[PDB]
Design a protein around this motif. Structure first.
Motif, short mmCIF file in Angstrom:
data_model
loop_
_atom_site.label_atom_id
_atom_site.label_comp_id
_atom_site.label_asym_id
_atom_site.label_seq_id
_atom_site.Cartn_x
_atom_site.Cartn_y
_atom_site.Cartn_z
N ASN A 87 -13.71 11.76 -10.70
CA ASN A 87 -12.42 12.24 -11.17
C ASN A 87 -12.28 12.07 -12.69
OD1 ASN A 87 -12.15 12.56 -8.39
ND2 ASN A 87 -10.08 11.69 -8.31
N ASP A 88 -12.57 10.88 -13.21
CA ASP A 88 -12.49 10.75 -14.67
C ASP A 88 -13.54 11.60 -15.37
OD1 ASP A 88 -10.05 9.52 -14.60
OD2 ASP A 88 -10.72 7.61 -15.42
N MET A 89 -14.69 11.82 -14.70
CA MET A 89 -15.80 12.62 -15.27
C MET A 89 -15.32 14.06 -15.46
SD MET A 89 -18.63 13.66 -16.35
CE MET A 89 -19.19 11.97 -16.55
N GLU A 90 -14.49 14.58 -14.56
CA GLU A 90 -13.95 15.96 -14.67
C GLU A 90 -12.74 15.95 -15.61
OE1 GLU A 90 -11.95 18.75 -11.73
OE2 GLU A 90 -11.76 19.20 -13.87
N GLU A 91 -12.19 14.77 -15.91
CA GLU A 91 -11.01 14.64 -16.81
C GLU A 91 -11.49 14.59 -18.27
OE1 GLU A 91 -7.24 12.57 -15.96
OE2 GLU A 91 -8.26 11.83 -14.15
N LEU A 92 -12.56 13.85 -18.56
CA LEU A 92 -13.17 13.81 -19.88
C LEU A 92 -13.76 15.18 -20.23
CD1 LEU A 92 -14.39 10.22 -19.44
CD2 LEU A 92 -12.63 10.95 -21.08
N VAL A 93 -14.34 15.89 -19.25
CA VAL A 93 -14.91 17.22 -19.54
C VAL A 93 -13.81 18.28 -19.81
CG1 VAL A 93 -16.32 19.07 -18.55
CG2 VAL A 93 -17.10 16.70 -18.41
N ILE A 94 -12.66 18.21 -19.12
CA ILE A 94 -11.55 19.11 -19.47
C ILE A 94 -11.14 18.84 -20.90
CG2 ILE A 94 -9.12 19.70 -19.22
CD1 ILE A 94 -9.30 19.41 -16.17
N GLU A 95 -11.07 17.55 -21.27
CA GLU A 95 -10.75 17.19 -22.64
C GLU A 95 -11.77 17.77 -23.60
OE1 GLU A 95 -10.80 12.95 -23.01
OE2 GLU A 95 -10.91 12.92 -25.20
N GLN A 96 -13.04 17.68 -23.25
CA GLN A 96 -14.06 18.15 -24.15
C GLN A 96 -14.05 19.66 -24.27
OE1 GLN A 96 -17.37 15.55 -23.08
NE2 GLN A 96 -15.95 13.86 -23.44
N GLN A 97 -13.44 20.35 -23.29
CA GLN A 97 -13.33 21.80 -23.40
C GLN A 97 -12.58 22.22 -24.67
OE1 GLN A 97 -14.59 24.38 -21.09
NE2 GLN A 97 -14.43 24.88 -23.27
N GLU A 98 -11.54 21.46 -25.07
CA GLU A 98 -10.80 21.81 -26.29
C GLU A 98 -11.71 21.77 -27.50
OE1 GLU A 98 -7.48 19.39 -27.49
OE2 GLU A 98 -7.30 18.43 -25.54
N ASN A 99 -12.49 20.70 -27.55
CA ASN A 99 -13.39 20.44 -28.66
C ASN A 99 -14.42 21.54 -28.79
OD1 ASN A 99 -12.98 17.40 -27.09
ND2 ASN A 99 -12.41 17.54 -29.20
N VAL A 100 -15.01 21.92 -27.67
CA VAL A 100 -16.03 22.95 -27.72
C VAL A 100 -15.43 24.27 -28.22
CG1 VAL A 100 -17.66 24.18 -26.36
CG2 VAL A 100 -17.37 21.78 -25.99
#
Lengths: 282, 126, 60, 45, 283, 282
Positions: D3-16
């Motif tokens: 769950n946190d792994m999919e939460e950090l990746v949603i966050e990283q989507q902004e960055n990308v």
């Protein structure tokens, strides 16, 4: 392709600062240094194309020195990084260490503490693996971790604590493990164990018991973890002074979770400390 | 006997449910990581080439029953775990690869910005 | 024995996921870094475009 | 944990997204700039 | 190494803007400010190397102010981040908060609401843990979540909203916390298992048992996972206990819930206020 | 803060191209368009700060048009227009902005997938959503991004089957099966794929193809052979062969009892049952 030796000679000729009367008519020496640095970079790229990595590193170093003389500190740091890269690829660890040091100094002086920490971690790796200078590696890891201070700093502190415990500094390693535990609260499962092991290498069984209790009460996962039981067993064995029981517990722990060389050394010093206590028994 | 079996049934039902949630979690994460991997270098390569051109132009410019159910649940959970750890492992590999590519991109971008700065400064000199 | 194996596989996978979770922390940090240098890069690129244009007008 | 792994990746989507955007614009402003330095060189000759 | 005090003095000397007649012959003051900022940065790096983190933070702050005067807002924001960074490492929470505020303002003014949101979340953390300014932390978390939502970052907004709702419920604002939990539920549909529970708990802290029952029914019907979850049974038991006004039954249910799933301080506070509300009902 | 209306007026004033005699003395109009775009961007950021998202989107759109006229950033501004229009609830303007950004980029696939999502959920334009998903998947395939193309094709096949195009949906499911074969990560996806494909083939009254798909899935993927989905598909095929609609309903309830059905399957099986009723009319 131009002869790199001729390019280096031309760079050296242009790299002479204006002196005496000529200084009153010659413009800023920065341009001469820039041209010499460019010539050195060209000769050095030619060397790199020829796989003469050490000569290419020396030529980047000369170009970086000329860039420093020209006031272009950032270009000098980049060239020093290139020197480190090619020296490391060429097997010249000492020149790579030097290049990393100049690059780190340049970056830190320019507010790029991030770059300084990355290259300090690389320098610590070079010191630990290539030159076996464990104290300097510990210093580099500590400094890199401090500038990084969650995860990169945590990695640097893991390296620093590992080397410090292997170096006889058990108390400092345990302190760094406590810092890691606090930063990671809310790796921990191992941290507690390692910390306790260090406290047990320092003959401070009470501190190891305190660490075990803190880990059990603060982290539910560690309480039921095999690491907690192993640490409790080691604490009990040291309390009863039964070295053979400690060995049996170590074998039992190895049978399910393989031990690493760090733990081997810590427990070996602990067993030798039991033997030293047996010497004090007489 | 019946109460313990019922508690076990409820436990395995929740465990299967949780495992599927995880499976729903691992797969979207993998999809997004694949997307971000695609997003992550070509433009930087083009800019390296254009900075080389700019360098040379600027230089020239300057010059110029119940038990059965339990067993079924167990089976399901096992299958889940199986391909859930496959997902996990590949995602870890993904993380690794993406982080290397990230470092690379960062270095390239920094270099290109320095190049641009240098070019503008030399153009001002001209 | 089947349930114990299942427990063992689940533990191993939790192991892998926390490790992967530690890597994604390093990745999020790196991405914040690459969004800081890419912003700088965009600004510098615009500045270079404008400066080159000003020199183009000067030489003309 | 997933769950946190999919939460950090949603966050990283902004960055990308922004990184892709900034780098494309930069490559867009470098190309124009090179064009300008080319015309500048053509005139200075 | 150069004396940081001498460097700061030189920066201050160079940082004086041109005035009067001299302004007609002196170029743009931006270069003087840039040089002063560079000198301050050098002195401050020397200070940080000496572990004098507070002085280094002050020197970054001076450099950031000079950069602002020079028009280089992005460099000023980076230097402010550095000021906050070293103040936090040095234990000076107030100066760290100030530095984060200037950096956030600079970033938001430049369209980088992402950086602003990250640093607003950090500022809210600092306020909540170091300064205990819970209202400002709530404001920071709400704003950070809103901006993250504007960037389509569901998970960070969800994290910020979790923090905001937690603090709001602990602060006596149960209705707003329940609304934020509803937002979290809607964003997370398709954390939820707890969300529903927490929301209901907040609605029960506000004495609105009907709303808690509605939330429980919605969670049971919408999310199959929540329907069979222990959290759903616990929420139903709490709703029944408040309906019958049996405080002891609520305590027994809380102990039963703790025995299998440990309660956290947030839930402790909510249920304590609920029991005290039963005592007020008893009055 | 500057008045956004005044900024837009100034941008419009500057956005007028040079005409007639003035064109012989005025430089390139690109700079005027750039200044107008910058003014529009400023006014629009002010609107965004005021939460007037639709006006901010319109101002980004004007800035993007001016940037296009200048030869540059227009697509990114269109992306910003899409973002703020979507946040403002204006789906049509968001669709338009995504279209211009997609055209400029052709990123196109990502924004095409987002556009298809907008069409499917906000505007219910299912045909355009299908087209967008198909195109996005094709471009992703051209980039060798197997998983994103697979996601786009899942969406496309789902909408196509819901839209009465069962044969095309089954073909896309076959493509998904072929792309996901041999990948350990997508096993379950395959397990469902086969089922879905068969269901589509059964929605088209094509029971033989469903049997062929079931046999292919059983023989090619061992996991699918023993999966509940395979048994359910075989039961559905048998029920359609015997024309026992009630048996199909019983099998559907049994399948739901262990694995919950989704609205897509509900629709497919409802059309299948209505087809049995149509056969009964026949």
């Amino acid at each position: 392709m131009s002869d790199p030796v001729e390019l280096l000679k031309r760079a050296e000729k242009k790299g002479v600062p204006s002196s005496g009367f000529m200084k009153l008519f010659s413009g800023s020496d920065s341009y001469k240094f820039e041209e010499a640095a460019d010539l050195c970079v060209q000769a050095a790229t030619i060397y790199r194309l020829r796989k003469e990595l050490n000569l290419a590193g020396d030529s980047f170093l000369k170009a970086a020195d000329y860039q420093k003389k020209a006031g272009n500190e950032d270009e000098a740091g980049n060239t020093y990084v290139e020197a480190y890269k090619c020296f490391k690829s060429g097997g010249n660890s000492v020149n790579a260490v030097d290049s990393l040091e100049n690059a780190i100094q340049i970056f830190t002086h320019r507010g790029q503490f991030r770059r300084g920490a990355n290259f300090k971690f690389e320098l610590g790796e070079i010191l630990e693996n290539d030159l076996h200078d464990y104290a300097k590696a510990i210093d580099c890891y500590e400094l890199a971790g401090e500038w990084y201070a969650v995860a990169l700093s945590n990695k640097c502190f893991i390296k620093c604590a590992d080397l410090k415990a292997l170096d006889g500094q058990y108390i400092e390693a345990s302190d760094i493990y406590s810092k890691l535990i606090k930063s990671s609260m809310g790796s921990l499962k191992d941290y507690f164990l390692k910390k306790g092991l260090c406290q047990l290498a320092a003959t401070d069984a009470v501190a190891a018991a305190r660490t075990l209790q803190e880990g059990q009460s603060e982290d539910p996962n560690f309480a039921d973890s095999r690491e907690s039981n192993f640490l409790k067993s080691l604490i009990d064995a040291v309390n009863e002074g039964d070295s053979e029981q400690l060995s049996e517990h170590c074998k039992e722990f190895d049978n399910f979770m393989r031990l690493d060389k760090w733990k081997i050394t810590i427990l070996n010093k602990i067993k030798e400390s039991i033997q030293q206590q047996e010497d004090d028994l007489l | 006997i019946k109460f313990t079996k019922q508690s076990s049934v409820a436990s395995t039902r929740n465990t299967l449910k949780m495992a599927q949630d995880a499976e729903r979690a691992g797969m979207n994460t993998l999809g997004m990581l694949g997307h971000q991997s695609e997003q992550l270098e070509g433009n930087l390569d083009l800019m390296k080439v254009q900075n080389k051109v700019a360098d040379e132009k600027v230089a020239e410019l300057k010059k110029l029953e119940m038990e059965l159910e339990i067993d079924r649940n167990l089976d399901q959970i096992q299958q889940v775990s199986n391909r859930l750890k496959k997902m996990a492992l590949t995602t870890g590999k993904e993380l690794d690869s993406q982080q290397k590519r990230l470092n690379n991109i960062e270095e390239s971008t920094d270099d290109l910005d320095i190049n641009l700065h240098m070019n503008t400064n030399r153009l001002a000199g001209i | 024995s089947r349930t114990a194996e299942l427990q063992a596989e689940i533990d191993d996978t939790v192991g892998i996921m926390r490790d992967n979770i530690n890597k994604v922390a390093e990745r999020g940090e790196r991405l914040t870094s690459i969004e800081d240098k890419a912003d700088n890069l965009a600004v510098s690129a615009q500045g270079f475009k404008r400066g080159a244009n000003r020199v183009r007008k000067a030489m003309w | 944990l997933f769950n946190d792994m999919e939460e950090l990746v949603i966050e990283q989507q902004e960055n990308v997204d922004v990184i892709d955007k900034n780098v494309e614009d930069a490559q867009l402003d470098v190309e124009q700039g090179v064009g300008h330095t080319d015309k500048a060189v053509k005139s200075a000759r």
